[PDB]
Design an enzyme around this catalytic site. Structure first.
Site, PDB file in Angstrom:
ATOM      1  N   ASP A  33       0.876  -1.174   0.000  1.00 34.65           N
ATOM      2  CA  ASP A  33       0.000   0.000   0.000  1.00 34.65           C
ATOM      3  C   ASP A  33       0.909   1.218   0.000  1.00 34.65           C
ATOM      4  O   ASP A  33       1.733   1.382   0.889  1.00 34.65           O
ATOM      5  CB  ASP A  33      -0.889  -0.017   1.266  1.00 34.65           C
ATOM      6  N   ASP A  89      -8.986  -1.176   0.197  1.00 28.61           N
ATOM      7  CA  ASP A  89      -8.840  -0.654  -1.148  1.00 28.61           C
ATOM      8  C   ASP A  89     -10.004  -1.139  -2.028  1.00 28.61           C
ATOM      9  O   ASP A  89     -10.595  -0.364  -2.764  1.00 28.61           O
ATOM     10  CB  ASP A  89      -7.468  -1.035  -1.740  1.00 28.61           C
TER      11      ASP A  89
HETATM   12  N1  LIG Z   1      -3.929  -7.901 -14.175  1.00 25.25           N
HETATM   13  C1  LIG Z   1      -3.463  -6.663 -14.353  1.00 25.25           C
HETATM   14  N2  LIG Z   1      -2.794  -6.406 -15.526  1.00 25.25           N
HETATM   15  C2  LIG Z   1      -2.301  -5.176 -15.760  1.00 25.25           C
HETATM   16  N3  LIG Z   1      -2.380  -4.093 -14.948  1.00 25.25           N
HETATM   17  C3  LIG Z   1      -3.056  -4.373 -13.776  1.00 25.25           C
HETATM   18  C4  LIG Z   1      -3.614  -5.587 -13.400  1.00 25.25           C
HETATM   19  N4  LIG Z   1      -4.209  -5.476 -12.145  1.00 25.25           N
HETATM   20  C5  LIG Z   1      -3.999  -4.230 -11.805  1.00 25.25           C
HETATM   21  N5  LIG Z   1      -3.302  -3.485 -12.748  1.00 25.25           N
HETATM   22  C6  LIG Z   1      -2.869  -2.053 -12.736  1.00 25.25           C
HETATM   23  O1  LIG Z   1      -1.872  -1.867 -11.711  1.00 25.25           O
HETATM   24  C7  LIG Z   1      -2.053  -0.601 -11.034  1.00 25.25           C
HETATM   25  C8  LIG Z   1      -2.237  -0.852  -9.548  1.00 25.25           C
HETATM   26  O2  LIG Z   1      -1.010  -1.265  -8.952  1.00 25.25           O
HETATM   27  P1  LIG Z   1      -0.735  -1.222  -7.377  1.00 25.25           P
HETATM   28  O3  LIG Z   1       0.635  -1.722  -7.206  1.00 25.25           O
HETATM   29  O4  LIG Z   1      -1.817  -1.905  -6.647  1.00 25.25           O
HETATM   30  O5  LIG Z   1      -0.726   0.369  -7.036  1.00 25.25           O
HETATM   31  P2  LIG Z   1      -1.913   1.465  -6.796  1.00 25.25           P
HETATM   32  O6  LIG Z   1      -3.242   0.825  -6.925  1.00 25.25           O
HETATM   33  O7  LIG Z   1      -1.558   2.594  -7.672  1.00 25.25           O
HETATM   34  N6  LIG Z   1      -1.711   1.926  -5.254  1.00 25.25           N
HETATM   35  P3  LIG Z   1      -1.988   1.038  -3.923  1.00 25.25           P
HETATM   36  O8  LIG Z   1      -2.714  -0.196  -4.336  1.00 25.25           O
HETATM   37  O9  LIG Z   1      -2.895   1.958  -3.184  1.00 25.25           O
HETATM   38  O10 LIG Z   1      -0.720   0.642  -3.245  1.00 25.25           O
HETATM   39  C9  LIG Z   1      -3.250   0.069 -11.664  1.00 25.25           C
HETATM   40  O11 LIG Z   1      -2.748   1.094 -12.539  1.00 25.25           O
HETATM   41  C10 LIG Z   1      -3.979  -1.110 -12.325  1.00 25.25           C
HETATM   42  O12 LIG Z   1      -4.822  -0.721 -13.422  1.00 25.25           O
HETATM   43 MG   LIG Z   2      -4.610  -1.403  -5.865  1.00 23.75          MG
END
Ligand SMILES: Nc1ncnc2c1ncn2[C@@H]1O[C@H](COP(=O)(O)OP(=O)(O)NP(=O)(O)O)[C@@H](O)[C@H]1O
Ligand SMILES: [Mg+2]
Ligand SMILES: Nc1ncnc2c1ncn2[C@@H]1O[C@H](COP(=O)(O)OP(=O)(O)NP(=O)(O)O)[C@@H](O)[C@H]1O
Ligand SMILES: Nc1ncnc2c1ncn2[C@@H]1O[C@H](COP(=O)(O)OP(=O)(O)NP(=O)(O)O)[C@@H](O)[C@H]1O
Ligand SMILES: [Mg+2]
Ligand SMILES: [Mg+2]
Lengths: 509, 509, 509
Positions: free
Chosen positions: C50, C376
């Site tokens: 996170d 989340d």
């Molecule tokens: N299967 C998938 N394939 C490609 N992109 C994905 C997939 N699942 C999630 N994402 C993308 O990955 C990103 C989310 O990554 P994440 O590492 O969880 O960071 P975050 O959501 O920006 N922040 P946080 O979750 O609050 O730590 C978003 O831009 C999504 O659209």
């Molecule tokens: Mg996320």
């Protein structure tokens, strides 16, 4: 009193200390490897890709690490190149060793199989080594070119390898070894890297003893003197006594007549350029300049031995016995001002047994690294002239040697068998880390090269970090002396066989 | 500011920290395992074979280690036994993980295969678990006997397991779980280990409130009072005013008549033994003693709940509503002097839902370790009553689970496949460390057991540390609750999956 | 006095401080991203992916960095998910900004174009957002599933997303917002991650006030009291005076008759389970237990508000006005012992406006991270119910938004145009860092996705980190609420617009 590690702790203490300095040079390995910047306590910086110079000139205190540095330290001593590969192999032999020790395999069984495997590795390398003639200049140039690359593709210029091969070829003492000390490496500035030249001569850090003497002599005959061109005082203590005032001028004119005689004895040999190891008296500098003879005083003992081998002269300790046949011959002797400082260039010699490599570049730290790239190139060319056997590079003879040891292990009964498979798998660290540093997929590539070695061909197939795909390394021109691999394996095997035998450590202070 | 480990350093920092506290309990594992002596800052010593109590009560400061202790800490919480096996498996998953990380296998691929394998491991354990009836006393006794062994064969006395099974069987709340807190464990000296008895009752750390009261009551009817046997002062503040000198005796005699009434209301129910949670007034102690009613004041709230469940009484907060049907029934209530101190033994009850295990031994540290061996035995018997599924011990279901995961891995394409084979090979650490601590050859034995599992039989074949050879563990009587293995693997898999996802560490101070 | 950075130094001081904490979370981004381990001064460790919890709970002291953390801190506040993307975009806007400042572009021109571009970015996101019904459970489940992934594919289990959607759907106050505080998140151990259940009720951290009370009530009618079930002392100070000895029993019996009355008034409503916010007097516990009414004392004010919304009861402050219609209704109220501790499970309610998510797992740190994955998922499902507009993930709407801003920049005259192109290029940092963390070639992929967006289709095309190639993200099921992107871009744009306006810094101490 004071610190002691027992059994499983002492074994993991050392293995870890070895793996950890082996990981310190892993990123330098290959053409697509990276350089390190080392700073000391005084603020003096040196930037290099040379494995051994990294390990030597960094403060390592852990006894098990100090002992794995010996592997790199004696790889430059015996070969010149392959210092990083010997340590990386030694590291991966230690990693593969604790996987057996954690499965309760006695250390004596591990070391038994390690040695049985390094024996086989040596006699398997003899069969897969191509035989090459000591004067195959196109092949020697490929061997010099493969050495400069690995320190980086940008250092590996065509005209520099040809220069190096021509200099190593020259200093060969028939028959028939190559002395690395005969090729003098000099480092001066300028706007260069491309202005590095092979000087068929010597570069003397001295000037003409008198300004009245010529500064450029063509087709000069050079005399070398170990004797001092001064007045000869007797060993049994002597003193003069004057009682007649007219006897004053007698002794002075007689003493300065001994210096006129000495200069006239040098002109008798026909020599017009003179290099003296000891001092030259002030009157004698005047008589030499009057005769037209270019002379230099207090020349280093090491530079006299260079000049003697280069021009074809003899170091004469008695000026009375200076024959006309004891003079050397060089096409140009000139006092130039290169890079601010003025030196005597004794160049264009006919048949030199000593040679100067004038390595030039824009900054002192750039120069110093190109210098290290040449020391490695001279080392491998010298190894091919002596040995006459070469192997294919790019981790190619490691994959081939790896798969042959694995089928040799199947023919071994006992738990020592596990140490031989371990040894085989350790060798594959060279092809794998060439891929890591290249950016490519190390796991995938290692499978394509391993599968392209099974059955008959190729044996000369390995990873090309520029192409990306697995290519034939012999047709590409990627080749190393046999001595680079046999030494790297033997020294990695002997030092890790020793660490593995340790079960107790006693550290003081 | 302040300390940060990057990538390959942070991953090796943690994995090593986990492997190193996993090696701290390795030598305790098995019947032929050894105990540890733990001393703290105050000089207080505790000697134990219990894995979790070793990890809990030693000063561990490395964040990655603190997090693998959680695995043992929640194994005692959910099972009671198997705390050392859970940590040792987690350790070997970490070791097998860096072998993949050093071959450049992305941590996300490792953790993917590790989870796919732990999923399969759970649904493979369900099929190989024998189904057992919650009251198969001969099988529950084997499960209790297998738990006491492992802390050492010498602790594992036949008559103690039978006692433990009879105590856990008693506190089962139909339907149909076992509360570990219902079996009260008391630790007193004596020349014992063999004088540990199951008390079908409660042991109250109190004495009779008045010495005039009887000290032994047979077939006693026990009343439990949450109310204070004192004068009832009103909540809204009250004060008495006396103006007539003859009114002095009025109030005193009226107040002490309220205490005569209360004691006469307790005798009305027919109760001859009384346990009060609050205080008992001095006058009322005299009237109780005059009636022959044995009473005790300020009994702990936790002991009142024990007595209520054990004798079959009700905790009454209003002495006026003390019915005759709210009394419990115990066959003997006696004040004994056991081990110097005098306590009230409320024993020989008819249908107890609470039970006391009087664990006795010669020195306090011997007692305390036998106590830990019973906490484990109670844990596993409770798990078999709830689950009804057991597996074979002696590293037997690890070998079977190992070989089935390996053939499940062949049906997996991709590099995740390497993580599943790694997971399978990690499970074999339990059979292997049973052999190390026994003295036997771990490598050789692991092969005989592995080969005796291939094809059909046995599945229940494993190493017998006393026999030396590989025996059928089900016919031997070596069995564990399914929950010991499924929990150990799931908690080891979830915690190491998390450490493996770490690539940066930020440590302050 | 004391420290001041001027102009180009102050601008580079801040931009660097912002880029440097933006690089601290870059590696967490995506499903193939990695976790961080944070340790503090006390030795307390927390491992998480996170973004905001990383930035919040690490000691950051540089003023320019503290101000970019606000961006993540108000992204969890307004959305729940997207905390890492908002910071990484803000970082790349700073990088792209100093490339303009080093070309002498005035900061006021940079900030002008940055704002003109973030305006356009908002009204361009409205057109490319798909419209989705607030009760499209299959689409809401994809939105919950895409959120759990990114913290890792292994956390993203199908059955958990369905549970989350069902819980968020339940707490919607018609019409028509979602309160994140209405979904109570509870963290208990067990051998789980898969044993996380949705409880249609409340979990109260209390026990039954009297042991004599039932422990399981089916189809129970629940009364909630804010009043204290004790004697009511008057506000104007009062004191009782007794002069007659027979008046003693009068007041006591009258006082305890007020407690008999209160318990008889609760039974009059028909309620058989009672949750009191204040204290309950000891006599009244006895009368409640005699009536069969399960009661609990000193229940938290926050838990009373939970129970009231969940069961359908009313918090009554006057026990005299406790009507029969003020009772709530739950299908099961039971006191269980989950994870050692004993609690009151008020579950199986008919029409709940409050809901409990019982998040379970093997170790406390595993639990705590799955808890963060649900916070989340609840955030994004709540955002889709409120907004009704979603966009495609996998860096898909960043590429589309990037190429549309670039053609919007061509229609802008002036040097502000350079800041709009800079803004567009900064957005491409999300697709690029998804590729870096995946292992794939970021430069190559970014070109295939950019070229597959030109002309008409796709708009919903982006990188699939598992497939490797560029896929249609809408058909795959990868979707985010519009609020994740519009908030991330606006907060990144407003904070970096402010830093860029700084030209002087004055730091004390
Ligand atoms: N299967 C998938 N394939 C490609 N992109 C994905 C997939 N699942 C999630 N994402 C993308 O990955 C990103 C989310 O990554 P994440 O590492 O969880 O960071 P975050 O959501 O920006 N922040 P946080 O979750 O609050 O730590 C978003 O831009 C999504 O659209
Ligand atoms: Mg996320
Ligand atoms: N063009 C090439 N393609 C593939 N492999 C190459 C190429 N050139 C050199 N190599 C291999 O790269 C390795 C040399 O890498 P390098 O980084 O120079 O380390 P080293 O020679 O082991 N030690 P040192 O040079 O003493 O620092 C050898 O194994 C070569 O065979
Ligand atoms: N007679 C036996 N022969 C072979 N294996 C046995 C025997 N008795 C017990 N075991 C095995 O030994 C292991 C138990 O060893 P032990 O040292 O008690 O550690 P633990 O139960 O994992 N943890 P703990 O008891 O909580 O400290 C289990 O894997 C048993 O199946
Ligand atoms: Mg080299
Ligand atoms: Mg045990």
């Amino acid at each position: 009193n004071m610190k002691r590690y027992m059994g499983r702790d002492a074994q993991r203490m050392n293995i870890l200390a070895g793996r950890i300095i082996a990981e310190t040079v892993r990123s330098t390995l290959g053409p697509k490897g990276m350089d390190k910047m080392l700073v000391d306590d005084l603020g003096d910086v040196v930037v290099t890709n040379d494995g051994v110079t990294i390990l030597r000139e960094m403060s390592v205190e852990h006894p098990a690490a100090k002992m794995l540095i010996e592997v790199a330290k004696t790889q430059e001593k015996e070969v010149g190149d392959g210092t990083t590969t010997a340590v990386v192999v030694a590291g991966e032999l230690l990693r593969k060793a604790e996987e057996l020790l954690d499965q309760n395999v006695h250390p004596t069984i591990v070391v038994k199989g390690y040695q049985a495997a390094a024996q086989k590795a040596q006699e398997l390398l003899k069969t897969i080594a191509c035989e090459v003639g000591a004067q195959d200049k196109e092949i020697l140039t490929k061997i010099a070119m493969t050495s400069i690359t690995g320190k980086g593709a940008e250092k590996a210029k065509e005209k520099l390898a040809e220069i190096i091969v021509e200099a190593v070829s020259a200093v060969v003492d028939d028959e028939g070894k190559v002395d690395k000390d005969l090729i003098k490496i000099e480092k001066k500035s300028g706007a260069s890297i491309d202005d590095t030249e092979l000087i068929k001569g010597v570069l003397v850090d001295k000037e003409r003893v008198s300004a009245q003497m010529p500064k450029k002599v063509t087709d000069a005959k050079i005399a070398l003197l170990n004797c001092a061109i001064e007045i000869k005082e007797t060993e049994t203590d002597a003193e003069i006594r004057i009682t007649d005032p007219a006897k004053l001028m007698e002794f002075i004119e007689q003493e300065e007549k001994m210096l006129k005689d000495m200069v006239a004895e040098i002109k008798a040999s026909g020599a017009n350029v003179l290099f003296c190891q000891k001092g030259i008296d002030d009157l004698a500098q005047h008589y030499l300049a009057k005769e037209g003879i270019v002379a230099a005083r207090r020349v280093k003992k090491s530079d006299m031995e260079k000049l003697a081998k280069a021009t074809g002269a003899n170091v004469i300790t008695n000026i009375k016995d200076l024959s006309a046949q004891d003079l050397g011959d060089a096409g140009l002797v000139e006092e130039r001002k290169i890079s601010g400082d003025s030196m005597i260039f004794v160049e264009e010699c006919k048949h030199p047994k000593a040679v100067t490599m004038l390595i030039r570049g824009t900054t002192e730290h750039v120069i110093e690294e190109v210098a290290r790239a040449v020391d490695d190139a001279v080392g491998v060319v010298g190894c091919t002239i002596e040995d006459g056997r070469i192997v294919s590079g790019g981790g190619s003879t490691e994959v081939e040697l790896s798969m042959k040891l694995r089928e040799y292990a199947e023919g071994i009964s006992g738990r020592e068998q596990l140490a031989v498979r371990a040894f085989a798998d350790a060798l594959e660290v060279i092809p794998r880390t060439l891929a890591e540093n290249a950016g490519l997929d190390a796991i995938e590539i290692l499978v394509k090269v391993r599968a392209a070695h099974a059955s008959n061909g190729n044996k000369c197939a390995g990873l090309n970090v520029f192409t990306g795909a697995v290519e034939d390394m012999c047709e590409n021109g990627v080749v190393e002396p046999l001595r680079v691999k046999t030494q790297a394996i033997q020294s990695a095997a002997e030092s890790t066989e020793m660490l593995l035998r340790i079960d107790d450590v006693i550290a003081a202070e």
